[PDB]
């Protein structure tokens, strides 16, 4: 009934264990399932919830045609309990082509961007009511984390970006208390392009690992001080870069300060967090496509520049299966905060031409201090059996 502080240490993480799966595409061939893209998982103090950006249609529908578009006025934010598929009883909390959500210990904060690409509106819904709204400041596509934000002591840090996806863009950090923007802070540091951050609490502040769509394959790091409202930026120092377009393990490079200019181009939403000096990260197995997904810990990857020592590799999704976005979230335990990650499994068009729609499933893993094993959890939907 009080605010969340995340004032506990971090779990000892030896790897990750399976937590949840949504067989949305398998269930949608004979069921009423929303067509979705870009999900995430945010946990209130009681349970965990899955969020998606639905296209305002079901899969077994005529409106599933030409779903591949990402910014339509019919896109909504779908909220469900984690494990429950997105069926006709799902709640659409807001209109959004991009959204973020946390729980501050009292209520839910949803940041939702809609409108036009030239002129966009970001609404802030707290406790079921609209509290504040902002407009585009660069008159570009106003975007957001497309994951959770960090809700520390009633202060919320949402990283929004406005600008080119192939050039300099104005990235701001909004500090919001109870739905009201109390501070705005421009991005400061050596990061040159910040987009779709995955943020986690690192008390007393917030650490975000984002994507770079301009001259970067290593991921930017944004550290946010919520008391001083101050921002610093750098790059992941782990050598083995984590953007889905990237060079091979031999020719990859990642120094701490500047983007590596090594297949910068596009990107994928990913995540990475720190283990004192180690770095736990996850990346697609394929180096050019979003096919497969592995997670591993790099020794001295948060401290030593360009360190390519890898331990504790898990194969979440095999190379012969379609992955997608991924993101981090944090769960408060009895004594210390655990780190978990969701992986998007994209099924549909622009790669599979036997169908006209484009949707996703989600597989959620959580960190463990114990033993685990090997496995494989793809979507596993026969594309020839689908409408």
């Amino acid at each position: 009934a009080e605010y969340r502080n995340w004032s506990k240490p971090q779990c000892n993480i030896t790897g990750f264990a399976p937590f949840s799966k949504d067989n949305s595409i398998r269930l949608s061939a004979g069921g009423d399932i929303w067509v979705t893209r870009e999900p995430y998982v945010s946990c209130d103090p009681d349970k965990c919830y899955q969020f998606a950006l639905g296209q305002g249609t079901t899969l077994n529908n005529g409106h599933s045609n030409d779903t591949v578009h990402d910014r339509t006025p019919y896109r909504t934010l779908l909220m469900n309990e984690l494990g429950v598929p997105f069926h006709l009883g799902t709640k659409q909390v807001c209109i959004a082509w991009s959204s973020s959500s946390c729980h501050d210990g009292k209520a839910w904060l949803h940041v939702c961007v809609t409108g036009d690409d030239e002129n966009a509106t970001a609404s802030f819904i707290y406790n079921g009511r609209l509290v504040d709204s902002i407009g585009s400041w660069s008159k570009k596509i106003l975007r957001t984390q497309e994951s959770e934000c960090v809700c520390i002591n009633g202060t919320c840090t949402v990283v929004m970006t406005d600008g080119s996806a192939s050039g300099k863009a104005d990235t701001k950090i909004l500090f919001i208390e109870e739905g009201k923007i109390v501070h705005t802070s421009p991005l400061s540091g050596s990061a040159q392009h910040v987009e779709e951050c995955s943020c986690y609490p690192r008390y007393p502040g917030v650490r975000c690992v984002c994507r770079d769509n301009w001259k970067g394959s290593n991921r930017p790091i944004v550290d946010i001080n919520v008391k001083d409202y101050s921002i610093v930026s750098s790059y992941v120092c782990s050598g083995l870069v984590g953007d889905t377009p990237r060079k091979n393990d031999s020719s990859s490079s990642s120094h701490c300060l500047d983007p590596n200019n090594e297949e910068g181009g596009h990107g994928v939403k990913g995540w990475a967090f720190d283990d004192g000096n180690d770095v736990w990260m996850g990346r697609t197995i394929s180096e050019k496509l979003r096919s497969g997904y592995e997670t591993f810990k790099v020794i001295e990857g948060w401290s030593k520049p360009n360190s390519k020592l890898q331990i504790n590799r898990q194969v979440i999704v095999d190379r012969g299966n379609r992955s997608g976005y991924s993101g981090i979230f944090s769960v408060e335990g009895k004594s210390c905060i655990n780190r978990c990650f969701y992986v998007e499994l994209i099924r549909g068009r622009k790669q599979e031409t036997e169908v006209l729609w484009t949707s996703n499933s989600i597989v959620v893993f959580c960190g463990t201090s114990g033993t685990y094993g090997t496995g494989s959890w793809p979507d596993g939907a026969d594309i020839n059996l689908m409408p």
Epitope: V68, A165, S166, G167, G265, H266, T353
Partner: antibody
Framework: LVESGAEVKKPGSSVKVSCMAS????????FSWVRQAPGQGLEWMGG????????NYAQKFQGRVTITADASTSTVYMELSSLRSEDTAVYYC??????????????????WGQGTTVTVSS | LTQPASLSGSPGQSITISCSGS?????????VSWYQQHPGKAPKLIIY???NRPSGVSDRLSGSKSGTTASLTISGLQAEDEADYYC??????????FGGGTKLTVL
């Protein structure tokens, strides 16, 4: 879809070609410029998304071509300075059929213009 | 990208035009486009995304990819299919790379 008329220029000058798209709002789409010398193939000079106003150029055309855009009118301009002798060609403006998105980031070339011939002479 | 300089075929048969390239070229990305240019006319897109085909384009044109070489197959070679044929690919960093052009000639 509509381009500027053919222009006659002397070597060492600068030429400005235009391409206006009509039929809706195409600020978020991708506009590219293609060169075809008489009798030769197609060469991709570079592209632009008029919303983002950040052009991309080919490796061989950097430092010579300037691509600008007006997103309200959905018009793309290409300025080619230092008109060397072998710059005579036909210049095409092309536009993606899909807007910018996560799965559509490459400059697709679906709707083509009619062309504009520039002739470096004397 | 590398393309044959010219091809010839008989009316009613099927012809195939190849487009070869490196790994950074066709072979790592599935963004391969085929354009058709009749003499004195602007290029026209006939294939995009390796296999996909725009509306209003004849079903006789079928694009395909195998390894690092893309292929355009024209079945039922008619006399209106005599044109230059160009292959384009995504280079990798906001860059497109073209072919050389194939002078298809029906007999």
């Amino acid at each position: 879809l509509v381009e500027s008329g053919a222009e006659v220029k002397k070597p060492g000058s600068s030429v400005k070609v235009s391409c206006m798209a009509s039929g809706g709002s195409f600020g978020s789409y991708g506009f590219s410029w293609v060169r075809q010398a008489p009798g030769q193939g197609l060469e991709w000079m570079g592209g632009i998304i008029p919303l983002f106003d950040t052009p991309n150029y080919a490796q061989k055309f950097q430092g010579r071509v300037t691509i600008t855009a007006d997103a309200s009118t959905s018009t793309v301009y290409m300025e080619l300075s230092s008109l060397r002798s072998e710059d005579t060609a036909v210049y095409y403006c092309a536009r993606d059929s899909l807007p910018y998105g996560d799965q559509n980031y490459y400059y697709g070339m679906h709707v083509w213009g009619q062309g504009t011939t520039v002739t470096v002479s004397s | 990208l590398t393309q044959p300089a010219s091809l010839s075929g008989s009316p009613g048969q099927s012809i195939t035009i190849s487009c070869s390239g490196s790994s950074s070229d066709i072979g790592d990305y599935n963004y391969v486009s085929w354009y058709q240019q009749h003499p004195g006319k602007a290029p026209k897109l006939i294939i995009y995304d390796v296999t996909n085909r725009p509306s209003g384009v004849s079903d006789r044109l079928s694009g395909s990819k195998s390894g690092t070489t893309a292929s355009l197959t024209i079945s039922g070679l008619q006399a209106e299919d005599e044109a230059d044929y160009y292959c384009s690919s995504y280079g990798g960093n906001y860059n497109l790379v073209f072919g050389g052009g194939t002078k298809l000639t029906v007999l």
